């Protein structure tokens, strides 16, 4: 049986790109923070970046401090940084450097897809710098992704820019030099994203009907992209074993959990409890994240769902 | 201000109704519910519920397969659903080859094709097929991108003409876009219903969302607060529920203070699954006549399984 934890991922020394995704509100942000904290703590000599590709950023709300387009350390951590790109501010910067014409952000700052484009550019930057230096980079990038739908668009982007760039070069009739470096860079991203030792996708879900089918669709689609996926976090579990609501909802949860357990026997299925307190701030996030490394035991570790800070 | 959506449900002016909010708060559940209530309340009008969330859940919610072609909800004579598949939609575009498949996966393609659906609808409404369109939107981030398309395209087309049959249709597009821009900014024709839950991570994003919508001159006068435990009314145990309700009620007071002019519609956490027409209909009733925890407390367990 595959162990019900992410210890293997947490202590991995090969993985460079870790996507955390799933349906809306299942716990991507909470889980991506938790994974990032666990990796950073277990690998102090590596530098980690947690980037949000969800345009509605929640990393700042999660940690309770203000992040932005420029990476900043999580306060209290020496090797974990967060990034939340603001498209308009980023395009302003691009306008300035391109000049060194002034209406770029006003024009493109709100085009659908702009968030994925800038997120992807950030991947291209680190891809290049990890090899060529000339600037700051990280050993490992964790992605707190947008819900399913738009994240698939983002993960299709290496293929899409690739297949596209085949044709465009001749149409133009050093502009062609950029194309080659852009093609070469995108190709590199495609190699690494489809390398199971470098890149993996951690799916997050809850034990409810509407999440089950969207989660299965997602995993199937990722596999069709040759994206590695071998880990599933089942979040917000009650473990109610009085109260008519809790026992009724837990009965439901346990029914689908049995189904999840049957289908995904080849996956790390990591079961996380619903906590009474708020999982925010480094302290509470860290305490919650421990159960990604060593599986949660409702009888042994049951009290911790009530031992989260309220400050 | 009455804590329901009755005035929206029985409106005879609203053409475009957006239902949005943070991930997993209950957009799909609420949008299906609103659509049902309007259709039941106005049999004389045809309603379309379009999902602009590229990960569609309307089919999952009703338990039947929807697609790019509008199809009636089984059990409803005047409600239809639409879930556009870009790859499928782009084949028909191309026919009327390799390119269309390329574009099928570009980020923003979902918003584009969804917006075209609005544009096509405008062209039919001006000339001589639904009376009201309800949008089950993607979570906050990408929905703001969609609502900025009228402005975005207008400006795009202004520069496209300057660098430049070809000229003629560019002006037609510019005009159709302006028509959408004015209608979306008309409080009588267009409104945005916000869905949220009484938790910390939801309310900061929700306030961010409403403020941004206001800056777009988009009307927002209704908030659905979903998944409320209410508790106490249960009848007086369960440390989990007791502690979680205390938390919810803390923030519910904050919601009530800030949004005093809004319709604040409080919806209970049901024990059963809100899927299928029957259960969605039973849930949707509390959008019209506000939910009473002391009286209607039984409905929480009455959902069909």
């Amino acid at each position, epitope marked *: 049986t595959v162990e019900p934890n992410l210890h293997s991922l947490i202590t991995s020394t090969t993985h460079k790109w870790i996507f955390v995704g799933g349906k809306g509100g299942v716990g991507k942000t909470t889980s991506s923070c938790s994974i990032a904290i666990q990796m950073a703590l277990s690998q102090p000599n590596k530098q980690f970046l947690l980037i949000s590709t969800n345009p509605a950023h929640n990393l*700042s*709300d999660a940690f*309770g*401090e*203000k992040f932005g387009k420029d990476a*900043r350390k999580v*306060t209290g951590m020496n090797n974990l940084s967060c990034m939340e790109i*603001d498209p308009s501010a980023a395009l302003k910067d691009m306008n300035d450097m391109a000049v060194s014409g002034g209406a770029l952000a006003d024009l493109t700052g709100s085009i659908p897809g702009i968030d994925e484009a800038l997120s992807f550019m950030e991947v291209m930057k680190h891809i290049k710098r990890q090899e060529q230096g000339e600037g700051e980079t990280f050993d490992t990038v964790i992605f707190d992704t947008a819900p399913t739908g738009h994240t698939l668009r983002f993960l299709q982007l290496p293929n899409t820019l690739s297949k596209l760039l085949e044709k465009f070069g001749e149409i133009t009739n050093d502009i062609s030099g950029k194309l080659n470096e852009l093609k070469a860079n995108v190709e590199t991203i495609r190699q690494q994203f489809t390398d199971p030792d470098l890149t993996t996708f951690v799916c997050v879900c809850i034990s409810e009907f509407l999440s089950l089918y969207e989660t299965e669709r997602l995993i199937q689609e990722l596999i069709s992209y040759d994206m590695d996926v071998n880990s599933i976090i089942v979040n917000q579990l009650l473990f109610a074993e009085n109260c008519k609501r809790c026992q009724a909802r837990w009965k439901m949860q346990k029914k689908y959990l049995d189904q999840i357990d049957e289908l995904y026997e080849d996956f790390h299925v990591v079961k996380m409890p619903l906590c009474a307190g708020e999982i925010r701030g480094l302290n509470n996030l860290t305490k919650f994240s421990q159960f990604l490394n060593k599986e949660y035991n409702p009888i042994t570790d049951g009290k911790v769902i009530y031992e989260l800070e309220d400050k | 201000v009455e804590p329901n959506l009755h005035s929206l449900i029985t409106s005879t002016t609203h053409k475009w109704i957006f239902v949005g909010g943070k991930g997993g708060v209950g957009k799909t559940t609420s949008s299906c519910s609103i659509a049902i209530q309007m259709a039941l309340s106005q049999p004389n009008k045809q309603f379309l519920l379009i999902s602009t969330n590229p990960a569609h859940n309307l089919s999952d919610a009703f338990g039947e397969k929807f697609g790019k072609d509008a199809r009636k909800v089984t059990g409803m004579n005047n409600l239809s659903c639409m879930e556009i598949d870009p790859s499928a939609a782009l084949k028909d575009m191309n026919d009327m080859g390799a390119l269309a498949d390329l574009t099928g996966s570009i980020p923003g393609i979902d918003e584009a094709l969804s917006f075209m659906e609005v544009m096509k609808h405008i062209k039919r409404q001006e000339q001589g097929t639904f009376d009201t369109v309800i949008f089950d939107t993607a979570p906050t981030g990408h929905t703001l991108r969609f609502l900025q398309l009228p402005n975005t395209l207008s400006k795009l087309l202004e520069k496209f003409g300057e660098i430049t049959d070809i000229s003629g249709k560019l002006n037609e597009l510019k005009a159709n876009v302006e028509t959408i821009r004015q209608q979306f900014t008309d409080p009588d024709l267009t409104t945005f219903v916000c869905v949220c839950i009484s938790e910390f991570l939801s*309310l*900061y994003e929700t*306030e*961010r969302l409403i*403020q941004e919508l*206001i800056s777009y001159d988009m009307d927002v006068n209704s908030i659905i607060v979903n998944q409320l435990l209410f508790a106490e009314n249960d009848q007086h145990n369960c440390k989990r529920c007791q502690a979680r309700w205390k938390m919810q009620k803390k923030y519910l007071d*904050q*919601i009530d*203070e*800030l949004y*005093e*002019d809004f319709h604040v519609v409080k919806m209970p956490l049901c024990a059963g699954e809100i899927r299928g027409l029957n259960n969605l209909t039973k849930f949707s009733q509390f959008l019209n006549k506000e939910y009473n925890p002391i009286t209607d407390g039984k409905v929480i367990y009455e959902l069909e399984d």
Partner: antibody
Amino acid sequence: EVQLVESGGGLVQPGGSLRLSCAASGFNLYYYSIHWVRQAPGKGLEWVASISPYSSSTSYADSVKGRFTISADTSKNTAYLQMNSLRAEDTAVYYCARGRWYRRALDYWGQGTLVTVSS
Amino acid sequence: DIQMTQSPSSLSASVGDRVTITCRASQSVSSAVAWYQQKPGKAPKLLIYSASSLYSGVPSRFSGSRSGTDFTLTISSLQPEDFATYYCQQYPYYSSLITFGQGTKVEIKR
């Protein structure tokens, strides 16, 4: 025990500049709004600037807009007012004060720092 | 531009008296009004928010009311510690600007 403490006040000449600090404790100012309110000698209260880190938003009274910049370091739990192109009428006691995301009334205030602008 | 017109500029009153101070917004601000007390050399203290809600720790002899765009602060029984200057403040949801009234100085009558 929440409190706000201003610092950085002093004497400056017309056209000069000055940075005020508002050190917060007892709460995380990321989740709140911080406001600067000033009071000229013998005059009433005048709001001049606001920052809401949780929403990436700032606002300014027209009287200081384009001259003053409000900011916040959420790693130090401190807010700042960078005051450029100062003039005689900017002479005042400057208070920083706290608001909430759901209530923009000012419940906690610092004891104020004096700014004098004169040639 | 928008205004919070507070009246009167000053008033004289005795201990035990009932005092009322008023503020008129130039346009509707719903109930988003607050009242403050300030003594010389000291920071203002929040008394009332949301036009009529008593802030924590404030004595109950303070109360507030709204009638359209008209807002009123009332001190039911003036105590020696209540002689001070009072300000109204609006914080309308639809605006990011904050506007104070011009202030009302309550002095002791003799």
